[PDB]
Amino acid sequence: NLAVLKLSEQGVLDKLKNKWWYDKGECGAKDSGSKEKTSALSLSNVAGVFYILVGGLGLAMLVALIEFCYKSRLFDRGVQMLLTTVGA
Amino acid sequence: SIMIKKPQKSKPGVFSFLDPLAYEIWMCIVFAYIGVSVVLFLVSRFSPYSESTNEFGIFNSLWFSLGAFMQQGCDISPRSLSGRIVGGVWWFFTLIIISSYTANLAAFLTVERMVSPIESAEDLSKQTEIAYGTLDSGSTKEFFRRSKIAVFDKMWTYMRSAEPSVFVRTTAEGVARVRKSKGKYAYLLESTMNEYIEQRKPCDTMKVGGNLDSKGYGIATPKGSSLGTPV
Amino acid sequence: SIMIKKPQKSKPGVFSFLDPLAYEIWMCIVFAYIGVSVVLFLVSRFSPYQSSESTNEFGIFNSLWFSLGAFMQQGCDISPRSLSGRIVGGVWWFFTLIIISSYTANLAAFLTVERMVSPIESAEDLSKQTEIAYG
Amino acid sequence: TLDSGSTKEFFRRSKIAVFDKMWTYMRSAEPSVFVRTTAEGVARVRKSKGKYAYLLESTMNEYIEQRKPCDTMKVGGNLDSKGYGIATPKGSSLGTPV
Amino acid sequence: FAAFSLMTIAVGTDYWLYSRGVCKTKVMTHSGLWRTCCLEGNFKGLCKQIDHFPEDADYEADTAEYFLRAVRASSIFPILSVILLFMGGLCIAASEFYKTRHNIILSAGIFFVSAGLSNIIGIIVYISANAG
Numbered sequence: 001n002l003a004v005l006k007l008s009e010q011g012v013l014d015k016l017k018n019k020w021w022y023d024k025g026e027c028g029a030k031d032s033g034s035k036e037k038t039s040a041l042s043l044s045n046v047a048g049v050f051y052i053l054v055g056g057l058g059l060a061m062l063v064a065l066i067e068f069c070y071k072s073r074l075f076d077r078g079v080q081m082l083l084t085t086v087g088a
Numbered sequence: 089s090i091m092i093k094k095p096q097k098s099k100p101g102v103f104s105f106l107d108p109l110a111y112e113i114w115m116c117i118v119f120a121y122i123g124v125s126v127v128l129f130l131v132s133r134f135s136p137y138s139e140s141t142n143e144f145g146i147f148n149s150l151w152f153s154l155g156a157f158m159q160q161g162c163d164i165s166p167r168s169l170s171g172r173i174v175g176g177v178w179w180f181f182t183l184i185i186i187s188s189y190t191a192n193l194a195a196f197l198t199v200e201r202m203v204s205p206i207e208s209a210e211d212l213s214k215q216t217e218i219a220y221g222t223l224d225s226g227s228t229k230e231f232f233r234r235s236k237i238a239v240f241d242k243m244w245t246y247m248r249s250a251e252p253s254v255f256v257r258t259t260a261e262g263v264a265r266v267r268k269s270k271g272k273y274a275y276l277l278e279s280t281m282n283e284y285i286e287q288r289k290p291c292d293t294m295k296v297g298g299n300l301d302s303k304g305y306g307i308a309t310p311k312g313s314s315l316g317t318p319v
Numbered sequence: 320s321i322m323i324k325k326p327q328k329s330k331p332g333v334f335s336f337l338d339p340l341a342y343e344i345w346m347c348i349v350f351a352y353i354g355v356s357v358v359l360f361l362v363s364r365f366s367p368y369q370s371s372e373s374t375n376e377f378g379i380f381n382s383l384w385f386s387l388g389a390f391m392q393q394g395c396d397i398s399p400r401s402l403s404g405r406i407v408g409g410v411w412w413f414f415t416l417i418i419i420s421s422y423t424a425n426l427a428a429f430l431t432v433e434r435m436v437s438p439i440e441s442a443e444d445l446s447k448q449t450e451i452a453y454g
Numbered sequence: 455t456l457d458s459g460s461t462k463e464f465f466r467r468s469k470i471a472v473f474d475k476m477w478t479y480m481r482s483a484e485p486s487v488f489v490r491t492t493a494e495g496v497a498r499v500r501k502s503k504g505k506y507a508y509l510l511e512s513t514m515n516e517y518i519e520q521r522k523p524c525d526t527m528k529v530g531g532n533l534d535s536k537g538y539g540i541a542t543p544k545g546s547s548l549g550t551p552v
Numbered sequence: 553f554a555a556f557s558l559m560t561i562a563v564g565t566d567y568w569l570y571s572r573g574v575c576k577t578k579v580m581t582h583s584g585l586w587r588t589c590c591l592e593g594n595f596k597g598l599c600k601q602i603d604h605f606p607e608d609a610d611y612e613a614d615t616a617e618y619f620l621r622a623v624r625a626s627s628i629f630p631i632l633s634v635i636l637l638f639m640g641g642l643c644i645a646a647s648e649f650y651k652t653r654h655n656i657i658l659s660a661g662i663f664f665v666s667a668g669l670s671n672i673i674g675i676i677v678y679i680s681a682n683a684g
């Protein structure tokens with residue numbers, strides 16, 4: 001009872017805890033958590049941009065296909081008043 | 089002082105401006121360029137109904153897409169609906185990549201220096217990976233035996249508990265051992281030896297950290313002879 | 320304390336490019352983009368006084384093209400050509416300067432993040448679900 | 455620190471060298487760096503404008519942080535591991551049931 | 553015809569990339585589409601057929617790492633280039649017969665365009681799940 005309080009008073013417990021937990025920082029993140037790498041951009045980062053780019057092409061081509069479909073074969077100034085009165 | 093093997097740094101080559109995008113991205117941006125321009129051609133010259141009314145073609149389109157990619161403007165714009173709705177996609181496509189390009193080139197043009205490993209010998213007490221030794225029958229090896237600073241005490245503990253011998257017999261022995269250990273065995277010597285080994289070929293060694301103490305070389309005489317005061 | 324395994328480093332998904340700006344800002348962008356184009360449509364085509372209406376080329380869809388054109392740094396062919404649409408357009412130019420320069424400040428930091436997932440912390444799903452065991 | 459205090463005694467009896475120099479500065483003081491009650495040092499730091507730090511225990515510290523006007527702040531980590539307890543006179547019969 | 557030949561040669565292939573891995577468990581690698589065949593070892597030319605089976609933290613329906621693998625180790629986008637490419641090659645072959653309607657060969661080139669659009673997606677998803 002009188003002995004453990006001496007070791008608590010003089011920091012010997014702190015020294016032992018440091019020795020057997022903190023001086024043996026070995027695995028990964030404790031050591032390498034405070035370092036820095038710059039970059040190198042790979043394709044896995046930028047992929048949805050290409051996906052959007054390709055999908056927009058097919059959408060645009062599909063639009064002109066049905067444009068040529070319709071012009072191979074608003075309405076009633078008048079009922080525009082109906083449209084705007086129901087819209088209001 | 090502490091001598092280690094100098095890690096071989098990389099030099100920027102000739103084409104060191106194509107660095108912040110990899111070659112996969114560089115070929116995909118070439119492919120998609122051709123694809124977008126030929127789609128814009130296809131949708132433009134499609135018999136709208138008269139025919140020579142619109143101004144686009146394969147050639148106009150090939151440099152329109154380039155002039156939209158690099159921000160230099162154009163001479164003409166798509167007027168048809170599907171031409172506009174395909175041009176806006178390319179407008180969005182450039183704003184992500186070229187921005188990434190400049191914002192990352194600002195990251196390559198800040199730093200080139202390596203992160204400098206096991207400096208100031210405290211991690212030499214901490215880690216168990218890279219070994220280290222001194223010269224046998226040496227004042228430094230005696231200094232770590234008699235030293236009472238706790239980090240030096242743990243260093244002496246690791247040096248006396250060694251499998252195999254971390255100690256060497258002559259200086260060039262430890263020199264060759266560090267030249268072949270590939271960063272797995274450090275070495276302790278004196279700073280004049282250290283800078284002399286640095287100033288020779290093949291320059292593959294390196295001094296890290298600062299010093300540790302202040303020793304000094306002197307002239308030694310037997311105790312009591314008459315040469316002492318004239319020397 | 321609760322020990323579990325290590326998780327795997329979740330790399331950012333498909334729609335991560337719009338990540339540095341929060342969704343509410345993107346909402347206000349779309350609303351302002353509609354409003355600017357419609358207000359610019361209103362200033363022109365307002366009986367300009369035999370060309371008495373077709374003085375300009377700005378229809379509603381041409382304006383819808385012009386605003387999107389001016390936003391992403393390539394101006395279109397036409398220009399407002401008269402007063403009082405241009406104190407829309409200059410304000411929209413100031414808007415597109417202040418926004419995308421704030422967009423592209425640190426974009427590359429947002430495409431390499433790799434944060435973790437952390438299924439449970441204060442356990443209580445060890446009460447709730449039946450899947451993950453514990454002893 | 456606080457006078458008639460365990461922390462003030464701890465820096466007197468402490469042997470770590472940085473704490474020794476801190477005790478040296480505390481005993482060589484013009485005027486008294488020591489106070490008599492807790493709220494005294496609280497008001498002294500609230501009026502010293504960053505010219506007088508204060509040492510206390512972390513529970514007092516977080517309680518003072520969680521009050522108005524919130525103008526105070528805990529900095530750094532901890533220093534040791536003390537503990538509050540129940541105190542009895544030596545040898546009486548209340549010890550083991552408490 | 554050259555594009556159809558080159559695409560068929562490119563699909564039915566053991567040699568696309570070269571890396572360092574294994575041949576068959578339980579090495580410089582002559583790796584291709586699914587036959588991750590190998591050379592320069594104890595045996596040269598034993599072509600293991602590969603698919604996806606990691607040992608992860610049990611991603612349940614992590615879609616950008618799952619459905620991506622589903623499109624990866626079943627080539628549907630690279631295989632569709634062959635389909636559209638021969639589908640248009642028939643239409644340019646059928647140009648002579650049933651002619652003078654001045655409409656049919658327009659339909660042909662759309663296949664040749666869209667096959668490339670499938671190809672470019674297949675390349676991106678393959679490079680994606682190599683580093684996936």
Ligand SMILES: N[C@@H](CCC(=O)O)C(=O)O
Nearest residue numbers: 223225226227228229278
């Ligand atoms: N001058 C030193 C060199 C070796 C050492 O530093 O231990 C000696 O003669 O002992």
Ligand SMILES: N[C@@H](CCC(=O)O)C(=O)O
Nearest residue numbers: 456458459460461462511
């Ligand atoms: N619990 C302590 C508070 C004062 C101090 O930390 O010095 C005591 O009663 O002594």
